[PDB]
Amino acid sequence: IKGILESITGFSIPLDNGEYALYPAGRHLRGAIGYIAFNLDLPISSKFLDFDFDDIIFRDLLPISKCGKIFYPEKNSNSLKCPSCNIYGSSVLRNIMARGLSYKEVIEGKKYRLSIIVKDEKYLNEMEAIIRYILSYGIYLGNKVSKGYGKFKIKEYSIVDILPVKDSEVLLLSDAIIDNGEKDIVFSKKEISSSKFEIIRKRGKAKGDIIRDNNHNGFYIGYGGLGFGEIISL
RNA sequence: GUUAAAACUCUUCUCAUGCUGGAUUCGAAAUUAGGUGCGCUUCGCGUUUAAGU
C-alpha cells in the first residue's frame, strides 16, 4: 500500500547515546497501528502483539524528497539524499526544553513514505480499515502520543501491487538484524492489558550498505521483520 | 500491538513618558415714536369824589 503521510505536529523518537533518528521507523508505525487495531478490536490485533509475524510488512517511513521519490540512506553518515536529486539530516532535529524536560523533536511539515506490503488476502480489509482510520482521524508516532506529538495524516493512499527484488545485489534500506552485527538495534514490545514492558536489544547491520548475498529473503527482510531491515535494488 | 508510559516553556514586568485645537475674521447692513386732538370754558377796572372857591 503506497502512500504519503504528512506531519502537522512533529515527532520525537529517541535512540541511545543521546541520539534521535531523522525519520520515523516502521516499528513505531507498527506499534501505533497495533494499538489502533486494539482500540477497534480488529481480528489481527493478536498478530501485531506477536513480534514474529511477517505476512504484513510495515517498512520504514522514509522521507520523500522534492523529487517526489524516496530519500535513500548513505553509509557511514546520519543523512539520506535522493539519488535523483542532491540531503535530509541533522537540520530537522530541534532541541526542546519544556518545563524542565529536555529532549529533541524532528520538525513537522515534511512528507514521509507510507509503504506497507500485504502478502495475503487475510488483511486487505483490515489494512483498508486501518488506512481509513489513519485518514479520517490521523496516526501518532513517537513520544508524547497523548500530548499530541507525532500527528501524521495521510496525503495519498494507493493500493498498488508489489514484487520482490529479483537481484542478489541489494542495498540495505534500513537496519538489518544479523547474529554478529555491529549496530545494536534497540526497540521495545509493550503488552497492553497485561502491564508488561521489555527493551529488545539485538545486534545487526546498519543501513546504506550493499550486500552481495544470494539469499534475497523474500522481499527485503534482511531477519526480524515487523520493520527492522529492508533492501532496495542496486 | 511505538526504547513506551509519565511531566502545560510556567512564573515576574501597565506602550509608558514629553507636546493646550490653536491661529485669522466686529451680528453687521436697511427702517424718523410717527400719525390724530385749539389751555379752552365761566367773571363789564366796578364802587366812592358837583370846575367849586
PDB file of C-alpha atoms (C1' of nucleotides) in Angstrom:
ATOM      1  CA  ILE A   1       0.000   0.000   0.000  1.00  0.00           C
ATOM      2  CA  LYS A   2       1.853   3.041  -1.298  1.00  0.00           C
ATOM      3  CA  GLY A   3       1.082   6.306   0.407  1.00  0.00           C
ATOM      4  CA  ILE A   4       2.192   9.743   1.501  1.00  0.00           C
ATOM      5  CA  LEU A   5       1.997  10.779   5.196  1.00  0.00           C
ATOM      6  CA  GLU A   6       2.208  14.462   6.147  1.00  0.00           C
ATOM      7  CA  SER A   7       3.225  15.541   9.664  1.00  0.00           C
ATOM      8  CA  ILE A   8       1.425  18.604  11.015  1.00  0.00           C
ATOM      9  CA  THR A   9       2.676  18.126  14.571  1.00  0.00           C
ATOM     10  CA  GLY A  10       6.241  16.934  14.943  1.00  0.00           C
ATOM     11  CA  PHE A  11       7.549  13.704  16.354  1.00  0.00           C
ATOM     12  CA  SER A  12      10.216  12.665  18.853  1.00  0.00           C
ATOM     13  CA  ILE A  13      11.640   9.145  18.650  1.00  0.00           C
ATOM     14  CA  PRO A  14      14.769   8.650  20.801  1.00  0.00           C
ATOM     15  CA  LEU A  15      17.768   6.356  20.480  1.00  0.00           C
ATOM     16  CA  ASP A  16      20.640   5.523  22.822  1.00  0.00           C
ATOM     17  CA  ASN A  17      23.775   7.661  23.427  1.00  0.00           C
ATOM     18  CA  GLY A  18      21.637  10.816  23.179  1.00  0.00           C
ATOM     19  CA  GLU A  19      20.748  10.464  19.507  1.00  0.00           C
ATOM     20  CA  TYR A  20      17.318  10.852  17.911  1.00  0.00           C
ATOM     21  CA  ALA A  21      16.733   9.369  14.466  1.00  0.00           C
ATOM     22  CA  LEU A  22      15.863  11.556  11.491  1.00  0.00           C
ATOM     23  CA  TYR A  23      12.866   9.582  10.147  1.00  0.00           C
ATOM     24  CA  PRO A  24      10.111   7.648  11.960  1.00  0.00           C
ATOM     25  CA  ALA A  25      10.881   3.963  11.849  1.00  0.00           C
ATOM     26  CA  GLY A  26       8.402   1.240  10.892  1.00  0.00           C
ATOM     27  CA  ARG A  27       8.480  -0.230  14.395  1.00  0.00           C
ATOM     28  CA  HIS A  28       6.768   2.954  15.628  1.00  0.00           C
ATOM     29  CA  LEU A  29       4.270   2.713  12.742  1.00  0.00           C
ATOM     30  CA  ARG A  30       3.549  -0.884  13.705  1.00  0.00           C
ATOM     31  CA  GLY A  31       3.123  -0.096  17.400  1.00  0.00           C
ATOM     32  CA  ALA A  32       0.731   2.769  16.675  1.00  0.00           C
ATOM     33  CA  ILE A  33      -1.326   0.679  14.246  1.00  0.00           C
ATOM     34  CA  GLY A  34      -1.456  -2.342  16.571  1.00  0.00           C
ATOM     35  CA  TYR A  35      -2.649  -0.059  19.371  1.00  0.00           C
ATOM     36  CA  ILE A  36      -5.209   1.303  16.933  1.00  0.00           C
ATOM     37  CA  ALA A  37      -6.387  -2.180  15.930  1.00  0.00           C
ATOM     38  CA  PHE A  38      -6.561  -2.989  19.655  1.00  0.00           C
ATOM     39  CA  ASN A  39      -8.786   0.086  20.201  1.00  0.00           C
ATOM     40  CA  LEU A  40     -11.087  -1.187  17.386  1.00  0.00           C
ATOM     41  CA  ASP A  41     -10.850  -4.925  18.299  1.00  0.00           C
ATOM     42  CA  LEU A  42      -9.748  -5.743  14.721  1.00  0.00           C
ATOM     43  CA  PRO A  43      -9.117  -9.508  14.222  1.00  0.00           C
ATOM     44  CA  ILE A  44      -5.375  -9.031  13.511  1.00  0.00           C
ATOM     45  CA  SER A  45      -4.549  -7.460  16.933  1.00  0.00           C
ATOM     46  CA  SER A  46      -3.171 -10.731  18.373  1.00  0.00           C
ATOM     47  CA  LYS A  47      -0.809 -10.855  15.381  1.00  0.00           C
ATOM     48  CA  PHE A  48       0.527  -7.335  15.999  1.00  0.00           C
ATOM     49  CA  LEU A  49       1.030  -8.491  19.592  1.00  0.00           C
ATOM     50  CA  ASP A  50       3.322 -11.176  18.150  1.00  0.00           C
ATOM     51  CA  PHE A  51       6.715  -9.810  17.117  1.00  0.00           C
ATOM     52  CA  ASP A  52       7.346 -12.583  14.569  1.00  0.00           C
ATOM     53  CA  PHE A  53       4.505 -12.288  12.034  1.00  0.00           C
ATOM     54  CA  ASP A  54       5.961 -11.420   8.661  1.00  0.00           C
ATOM     55  CA  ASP A  55       2.820 -11.535   6.444  1.00  0.00           C
ATOM     56  CA  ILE A  56       2.194  -7.801   6.791  1.00  0.00           C
ATOM     57  CA  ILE A  57       5.464  -5.919   6.380  1.00  0.00           C
ATOM     58  CA  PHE A  58       5.386  -2.382   7.729  1.00  0.00           C
ATOM     59  CA  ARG A  59       8.511  -0.946   6.103  1.00  0.00           C
ATOM     60  CA  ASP A  60      10.280   2.154   7.400  1.00  0.00           C
ATOM     61  CA  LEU A  61       8.862   5.599   6.828  1.00  0.00           C
ATOM     62  CA  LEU A  62      11.483   7.178   4.568  1.00  0.00           C
ATOM     63  CA  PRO A  63      11.498  10.971   3.916  1.00  0.00           C
ATOM     64  CA  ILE A  64      10.179  11.627   0.411  1.00  0.00           C
ATOM     65  CA  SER A  65      12.125  14.427  -1.360  1.00  0.00           C
ATOM     66  CA  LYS A  66      11.300  17.367  -3.664  1.00  0.00           C
ATOM     67  CA  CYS A  67      11.979  14.808  -6.440  1.00  0.00           C
ATOM     68  CA  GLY A  68       8.819  13.071  -5.199  1.00  0.00           C
ATOM     69  CA  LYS A  69      10.851   9.854  -4.869  1.00  0.00           C
ATOM     70  CA  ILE A  70      12.073   8.248  -1.599  1.00  0.00           C
ATOM     71  CA  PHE A  71      15.302   9.596   0.007  1.00  0.00           C
ATOM     72  CA  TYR A  72      17.804   6.697   0.317  1.00  0.00           C
ATOM     73  CA  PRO A  73      20.285   6.112   3.170  1.00  0.00           C
ATOM     74  CA  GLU A  74      24.028   6.863   2.984  1.00  0.00           C
ATOM     75  CA  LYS A  75      26.635   4.508   4.568  1.00  0.00           C
ATOM     76  CA  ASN A  76      28.788   5.897   7.450  1.00  0.00           C
ATOM     77  CA  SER A  77      26.709   9.094   7.959  1.00  0.00           C
ATOM     78  CA  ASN A  78      23.480  10.395   9.562  1.00  0.00           C
ATOM     79  CA  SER A  79      21.559  11.643   6.481  1.00  0.00           C
ATOM     80  CA  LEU A  80      19.653  10.487   3.350  1.00  0.00           C
ATOM     81  CA  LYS A  81      19.914  12.012  -0.179  1.00  0.00           C
ATOM     82  CA  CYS A  82      17.617  11.482  -3.210  1.00  0.00           C
ATOM     83  CA  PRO A  83      19.927   9.693  -5.684  1.00  0.00           C
ATOM     84  CA  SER A  84      17.720  11.541  -8.168  1.00  0.00           C
ATOM     85  CA  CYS A  85      18.385  14.959  -6.551  1.00  0.00           C
ATOM     86  CA  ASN A  86      21.366  16.198  -4.473  1.00  0.00           C
ATOM     87  CA  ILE A  87      20.126  15.795   1.930  1.00  0.00           C
ATOM     88  CA  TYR A  88      17.799  15.075   4.852  1.00  0.00           C
ATOM     89  CA  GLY A  89      19.538  15.075   8.209  1.00  0.00           C
ATOM     90  CA  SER A  90      20.977  16.977  11.213  1.00  0.00           C
ATOM     91  CA  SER A  91      18.912  20.051  10.300  1.00  0.00           C
ATOM     92  CA  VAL A  92      15.379  18.924  11.207  1.00  0.00           C
ATOM     93  CA  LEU A  93      16.181  17.796  14.750  1.00  0.00           C
ATOM     94  CA  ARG A  94      15.223  20.668  17.021  1.00  0.00           C
ATOM     95  CA  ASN A  95      16.273  20.937  20.657  1.00  0.00           C
ATOM     96  CA  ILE A  96      13.340  21.396  23.029  1.00  0.00           C
ATOM     97  CA  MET A  97      13.463  22.427  26.694  1.00  0.00           C
ATOM     98  CA  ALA A  98       9.935  22.394  28.130  1.00  0.00           C
ATOM     99  CA  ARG A  99       9.252  22.925  31.868  1.00  0.00           C
ATOM    100  CA  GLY A 100      12.404  21.095  32.840  1.00  0.00           C
ATOM    101  CA  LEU A 101      12.055  18.307  30.274  1.00  0.00           C
ATOM    102  CA  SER A 102      14.774  18.500  27.631  1.00  0.00           C
ATOM    103  CA  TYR A 103      14.575  16.339  24.516  1.00  0.00           C
ATOM    104  CA  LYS A 104      14.769  16.592  20.720  1.00  0.00           C
ATOM    105  CA  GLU A 105      11.981  16.638  18.141  1.00  0.00           C
ATOM    106  CA  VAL A 106      12.014  16.369  14.361  1.00  0.00           C
ATOM    107  CA  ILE A 107      10.223  19.361  12.794  1.00  0.00           C
ATOM    108  CA  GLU A 108       6.833  18.985  11.130  1.00  0.00           C
ATOM    109  CA  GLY A 109       5.623  19.602   7.588  1.00  0.00           C
ATOM    110  CA  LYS A 110       7.973  17.216   5.853  1.00  0.00           C
ATOM    111  CA  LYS A 111       6.343  14.445   3.814  1.00  0.00           C
ATOM    112  CA  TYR A 112       7.302  10.792   4.512  1.00  0.00           C
ATOM    113  CA  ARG A 113       6.617   7.477   2.709  1.00  0.00           C
ATOM    114  CA  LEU A 114       3.829   5.156   3.989  1.00  0.00           C
ATOM    115  CA  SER A 115       4.756   1.979   2.082  1.00  0.00           C
ATOM    116  CA  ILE A 116       3.422  -1.213   3.769  1.00  0.00           C
ATOM    117  CA  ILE A 117       3.123  -4.582   1.943  1.00  0.00           C
ATOM    118  CA  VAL A 118       0.467  -7.266   2.439  1.00  0.00           C
ATOM    119  CA  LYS A 119       1.258 -10.806   1.282  1.00  0.00           C
ATOM    120  CA  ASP A 120      -2.161 -12.397   1.964  1.00  0.00           C
ATOM    121  CA  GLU A 121      -5.834 -11.639   1.358  1.00  0.00           C
ATOM    122  CA  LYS A 122      -6.350 -12.131   5.092  1.00  0.00           C
ATOM    123  CA  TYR A 123      -5.781  -8.373   5.769  1.00  0.00           C
ATOM    124  CA  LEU A 124      -6.707  -6.218   2.751  1.00  0.00           C
ATOM    125  CA  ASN A 125      -9.981  -5.460   4.552  1.00  0.00           C
ATOM    126  CA  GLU A 126      -8.110  -4.977   7.839  1.00  0.00           C
ATOM    127  CA  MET A 127      -5.397  -2.699   6.434  1.00  0.00           C
ATOM    128  CA  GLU A 128      -8.129  -0.887   4.471  1.00  0.00           C
ATOM    129  CA  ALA A 129      -9.784  -0.231   7.830  1.00  0.00           C
ATOM    130  CA  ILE A 130      -6.505   0.962   9.397  1.00  0.00           C
ATOM    131  CA  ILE A 131      -5.705   3.343   6.482  1.00  0.00           C
ATOM    132  CA  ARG A 132      -9.318   4.603   6.619  1.00  0.00           C
ATOM    133  CA  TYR A 133      -8.842   5.263  10.335  1.00  0.00           C
ATOM    134  CA  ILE A 134      -5.440   6.923   9.632  1.00  0.00           C
ATOM    135  CA  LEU A 135      -7.255   9.017   7.000  1.00  0.00           C
ATOM    136  CA  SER A 136     -10.213  10.381   8.897  1.00  0.00           C
ATOM    137  CA  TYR A 137      -8.588  10.802  12.349  1.00  0.00           C
ATOM    138  CA  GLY A 138      -4.794  10.534  11.903  1.00  0.00           C
ATOM    139  CA  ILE A 139      -1.996   8.387  13.377  1.00  0.00           C
ATOM    140  CA  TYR A 140       0.631   9.129  16.036  1.00  0.00           C
ATOM    141  CA  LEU A 141       4.300   8.140  16.183  1.00  0.00           C
ATOM    142  CA  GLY A 142       6.970   8.728  18.802  1.00  0.00           C
ATOM    143  CA  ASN A 143       6.886  10.067  22.321  1.00  0.00           C
ATOM    144  CA  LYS A 144       4.086  12.168  23.835  1.00  0.00           C
ATOM    145  CA  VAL A 145       1.306  10.489  21.845  1.00  0.00           C
ATOM    146  CA  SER A 146      -1.224  11.585  24.443  1.00  0.00           C
ATOM    147  CA  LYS A 147       0.192  15.133  24.274  1.00  0.00           C
ATOM    148  CA  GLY A 148      -0.364  15.389  20.527  1.00  0.00           C
ATOM    149  CA  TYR A 149       3.239  14.967  19.391  1.00  0.00           C
ATOM    150  CA  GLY A 150       3.551  12.876  16.256  1.00  0.00           C
ATOM    151  CA  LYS A 151       0.405  13.889  14.338  1.00  0.00           C
ATOM    152  CA  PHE A 152       0.547  12.229  10.897  1.00  0.00           C
ATOM    153  CA  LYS A 153      -2.340  12.404   8.451  1.00  0.00           C
ATOM    154  CA  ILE A 154      -2.383  10.718   5.062  1.00  0.00           C
ATOM    155  CA  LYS A 155      -1.909  12.662   1.880  1.00  0.00           C
ATOM    156  CA  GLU A 156      -2.075   9.742  -0.553  1.00  0.00           C
ATOM    157  CA  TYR A 157      -3.455   6.180  -0.446  1.00  0.00           C
ATOM    158  CA  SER A 158      -2.887   3.858  -3.421  1.00  0.00           C
ATOM    159  CA  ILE A 159      -3.335   0.068  -3.361  1.00  0.00           C
ATOM    160  CA  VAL A 160      -0.668  -0.807  -5.939  1.00  0.00           C
ATOM    161  CA  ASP A 161       0.792  -4.320  -6.427  1.00  0.00           C
ATOM    162  CA  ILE A 162       4.359  -5.051  -5.188  1.00  0.00           C
ATOM    163  CA  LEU A 163       7.015  -7.585  -6.351  1.00  0.00           C
ATOM    164  CA  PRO A 164      10.239  -8.866  -4.666  1.00  0.00           C
ATOM    165  CA  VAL A 165      13.744  -7.630  -5.662  1.00  0.00           C
ATOM    166  CA  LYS A 166      14.887 -10.040  -8.426  1.00  0.00           C
ATOM    167  CA  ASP A 167      18.511  -9.178  -7.634  1.00  0.00           C
ATOM    168  CA  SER A 168      21.008 -10.730  -5.241  1.00  0.00           C
ATOM    169  CA  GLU A 169      22.880  -7.399  -5.252  1.00  0.00           C
ATOM    170  CA  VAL A 170      20.778  -5.472  -2.732  1.00  0.00           C
ATOM    171  CA  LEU A 171      21.380  -2.342  -0.665  1.00  0.00           C
ATOM    172  CA  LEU A 172      20.093  -2.335   2.948  1.00  0.00           C
ATOM    173  CA  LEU A 173      17.308   0.317   3.077  1.00  0.00           C
ATOM    174  CA  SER A 174      17.153   0.048   6.874  1.00  0.00           C
ATOM    175  CA  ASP A 175      18.896  -1.594   9.822  1.00  0.00           C
ATOM    176  CA  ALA A 176      19.002  -5.362   9.295  1.00  0.00           C
ATOM    177  CA  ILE A 177      19.462  -7.894  12.098  1.00  0.00           C
ATOM    178  CA  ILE A 178      22.460 -10.240  11.940  1.00  0.00           C
ATOM    179  CA  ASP A 179      23.881 -12.507  14.644  1.00  0.00           C
ATOM    180  CA  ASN A 180      27.357 -10.905  14.611  1.00  0.00           C
ATOM    181  CA  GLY A 181      26.196  -7.398  13.686  1.00  0.00           C
ATOM    182  CA  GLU A 182      27.886  -4.183  14.786  1.00  0.00           C
ATOM    183  CA  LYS A 183      24.977  -1.734  15.160  1.00  0.00           C
ATOM    184  CA  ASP A 184      22.946  -2.571  18.251  1.00  0.00           C
ATOM    185  CA  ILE A 185      19.282  -2.163  17.273  1.00  0.00           C
ATOM    186  CA  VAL A 186      17.130  -1.418  20.316  1.00  0.00           C
ATOM    187  CA  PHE A 187      13.334  -1.457  20.294  1.00  0.00           C
ATOM    188  CA  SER A 188      10.517  -2.376  22.660  1.00  0.00           C
ATOM    189  CA  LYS A 189       7.431  -4.581  22.922  1.00  0.00           C
ATOM    190  CA  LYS A 190       4.747  -3.411  25.340  1.00  0.00           C
ATOM    191  CA  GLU A 191       1.749  -5.555  26.263  1.00  0.00           C
ATOM    192  CA  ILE A 192      -1.407  -3.554  26.973  1.00  0.00           C
ATOM    193  CA  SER A 193      -3.985  -5.226  29.268  1.00  0.00           C
ATOM    194  CA  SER A 194      -1.030  -7.181  30.726  1.00  0.00           C
ATOM    195  CA  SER A 195       1.248  -4.331  32.015  1.00  0.00           C
ATOM    196  CA  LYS A 196       4.416  -5.826  30.521  1.00  0.00           C
ATOM    197  CA  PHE A 197       7.394  -3.850  29.219  1.00  0.00           C
ATOM    198  CA  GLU A 198      10.621  -5.137  27.628  1.00  0.00           C
ATOM    199  CA  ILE A 199      13.516  -3.486  25.676  1.00  0.00           C
ATOM    200  CA  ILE A 200      14.542  -5.771  22.738  1.00  0.00           C
ATOM    201  CA  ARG A 201      18.284  -5.079  22.098  1.00  0.00           C
ATOM    202  CA  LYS A 202      19.762  -7.172  19.245  1.00  0.00           C
ATOM    203  CA  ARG A 203      22.926  -6.782  17.197  1.00  0.00           C
ATOM    204  CA  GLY A 204      22.675  -6.200  13.473  1.00  0.00           C
ATOM    205  CA  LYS A 205      23.841  -4.423  10.339  1.00  0.00           C
ATOM    206  CA  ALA A 206      23.264  -0.754   9.565  1.00  0.00           C
ATOM    207  CA  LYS A 207      21.539   0.837   6.572  1.00  0.00           C
ATOM    208  CA  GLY A 208      23.008   2.057   3.279  1.00  0.00           C
ATOM    209  CA  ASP A 209      25.366  -0.903   2.765  1.00  0.00           C
ATOM    210  CA  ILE A 210      25.408  -3.063  -0.348  1.00  0.00           C
ATOM    211  CA  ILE A 211      25.008  -6.783   0.379  1.00  0.00           C
ATOM    212  CA  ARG A 212      26.168  -9.368  -2.189  1.00  0.00           C
ATOM    213  CA  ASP A 213      24.020 -12.174  -0.839  1.00  0.00           C
ATOM    214  CA  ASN A 214      22.124 -14.770  -2.895  1.00  0.00           C
ATOM    215  CA  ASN A 215      19.508 -15.409  -0.114  1.00  0.00           C
ATOM    216  CA  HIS A 216      17.240 -12.430  -1.118  1.00  0.00           C
ATOM    217  CA  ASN A 217      14.959 -13.323   1.873  1.00  0.00           C
ATOM    218  CA  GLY A 218      11.668 -12.888   0.033  1.00  0.00           C
ATOM    219  CA  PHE A 219      11.066  -9.154  -0.364  1.00  0.00           C
ATOM    220  CA  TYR A 220      13.782  -7.389   1.679  1.00  0.00           C
ATOM    221  CA  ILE A 221      13.601  -8.983   5.167  1.00  0.00           C
ATOM    222  CA  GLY A 222      17.375  -8.606   5.503  1.00  0.00           C
ATOM    223  CA  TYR A 223      15.612 -11.247   9.984  1.00  0.00           C
ATOM    224  CA  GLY A 224      13.175  -9.685  12.437  1.00  0.00           C
ATOM    225  CA  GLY A 225      10.649  -8.225  10.033  1.00  0.00           C
ATOM    226  CA  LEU A 226       7.971  -6.003  11.639  1.00  0.00           C
ATOM    227  CA  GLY A 227      10.063  -3.106  10.463  1.00  0.00           C
ATOM    228  CA  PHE A 228      13.774  -3.947  11.150  1.00  0.00           C
ATOM    229  CA  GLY A 229      15.769  -4.339   7.899  1.00  0.00           C
ATOM    230  CA  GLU A 230      14.824  -3.536   4.313  1.00  0.00           C
ATOM    231  CA  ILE A 231      16.591  -3.663   0.932  1.00  0.00           C
ATOM    232  CA  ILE A 232      16.459  -1.939  -2.462  1.00  0.00           C
ATOM    233  CA  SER A 233      17.559  -2.937  -5.961  1.00  0.00           C
ATOM    234  CA  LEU A 234      21.018  -1.573  -6.770  1.00  0.00           C
TER     235      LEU A 234
ATOM    236  C1'   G B   1       0.458  -4.213  19.490  1.00  0.00           C
ATOM    237  C1'   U B   2       5.690   2.858  19.141  1.00  0.00           C
ATOM    238  C1'   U B   3      13.413   2.065  23.903  1.00  0.00           C
ATOM    239  C1'   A B   4       6.732   3.122  25.609  1.00  0.00           C
ATOM    240  C1'   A B   5       4.004   5.487  29.700  1.00  0.00           C
ATOM    241  C1'   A B   6       4.630   9.785  32.820  1.00  0.00           C
ATOM    242  C1'   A B   7       5.549  15.697  33.146  1.00  0.00           C
ATOM    243  C1'   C B   8       1.398  22.643  30.447  1.00  0.00           C
ATOM    244  C1'   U B   9       8.440  26.922  28.223  1.00  0.00           C
ATOM    245  C1'   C B  10       5.394  28.064  33.582  1.00  0.00           C
ATOM    246  C1'   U B  11       6.406  32.302  36.889  1.00  0.00           C
ATOM    247  C1'   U B  12       7.760  38.356  37.459  1.00  0.00           C
ATOM    248  C1'   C B  13       7.327  43.065  34.432  1.00  0.00           C
ATOM    249  C1'   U B  14       0.977  48.912  32.908  1.00  0.00           C
ATOM    250  C1'   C B  15       3.319  51.235  25.433  1.00  0.00           C
ATOM    251  C1'   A B  16       4.790  54.428  29.291  1.00  0.00           C
ATOM    252  C1'   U B  17       6.949  59.334  29.058  1.00  0.00           C
ATOM    253  C1'   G B  18       7.423  64.683  26.623  1.00  0.00           C
ATOM    254  C1'   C B  19       3.557  68.140  23.423  1.00  0.00           C
ATOM    255  C1'   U B  20      -3.126  73.426  25.331  1.00  0.00           C
ATOM    256  C1'   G B  21      -7.113  72.528  18.548  1.00  0.00           C
ATOM    257  C1'   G B  22      -4.558  76.824  18.366  1.00  0.00           C
ATOM    258  C1'   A B  23      -4.045  80.782  14.985  1.00  0.00           C
ATOM    259  C1'   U B  24      -7.114  84.577  11.171  1.00  0.00           C
ATOM    260  C1'   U B  25     -12.387  87.149  10.947  1.00  0.00           C
ATOM    261  C1'   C B  26     -16.833  93.494  14.955  1.00  0.00           C
ATOM    262  C1'   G B  27     -24.197  90.262  14.399  1.00  0.00           C
ATOM    263  C1'   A B  28     -23.265  93.927  10.737  1.00  0.00           C
ATOM    264  C1'   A B  29     -26.347  96.102   6.951  1.00  0.00           C
ATOM    265  C1'   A B  30     -31.787  98.758   5.742  1.00  0.00           C
ATOM    266  C1'   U B  31     -36.324 101.281   8.641  1.00  0.00           C
ATOM    267  C1'   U B  32     -37.615 109.466  11.868  1.00  0.00           C
ATOM    268  C1'   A B  33     -42.377 107.115  18.097  1.00  0.00           C
ATOM    269  C1'   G B  34     -44.771 108.838  13.752  1.00  0.00           C
ATOM    270  C1'   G B  35     -49.794 109.758  12.876  1.00  0.00           C
ATOM    271  C1'   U B  36     -54.985 112.239  15.437  1.00  0.00           C
ATOM    272  C1'   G B  37     -56.746 116.269  19.247  1.00  0.00           C
ATOM    273  C1'   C B  38     -57.038 124.866  19.661  1.00  0.00           C
ATOM    274  C1'   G B  39     -55.422 125.924  27.613  1.00  0.00           C
ATOM    275  C1'   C B  40     -60.493 126.187  26.481  1.00  0.00           C
ATOM    276  C1'   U B  41     -64.944 127.226  29.372  1.00  0.00           C
ATOM    277  C1'   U B  42     -67.106 130.971  33.370  1.00  0.00           C
ATOM    278  C1'   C B  43     -66.015 136.652  35.594  1.00  0.00           C
ATOM    279  C1'   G B  44     -68.167 144.827  32.313  1.00  0.00           C
ATOM    280  C1'   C B  45     -61.474 148.233  36.481  1.00  0.00           C
ATOM    281  C1'   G B  46     -66.768 148.335  39.040  1.00  0.00           C
ATOM    282  C1'   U B  47     -67.632 151.002  43.528  1.00  0.00           C
ATOM    283  C1'   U B  48     -66.584 156.222  46.275  1.00  0.00           C
ATOM    284  C1'   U B  49     -65.382 162.420  44.995  1.00  0.00           C
ATOM    285  C1'   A B  50     -70.895 168.919  41.939  1.00  0.00           C
ATOM    286  C1'   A B  51     -64.529 173.337  37.873  1.00  0.00           C
ATOM    287  C1'   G B  52     -66.174 174.671  43.181  1.00  0.00           C
ATOM    288  C1'   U B  53     -63.940 178.987  45.645  1.00  0.00           C
TER     289        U B  53
END
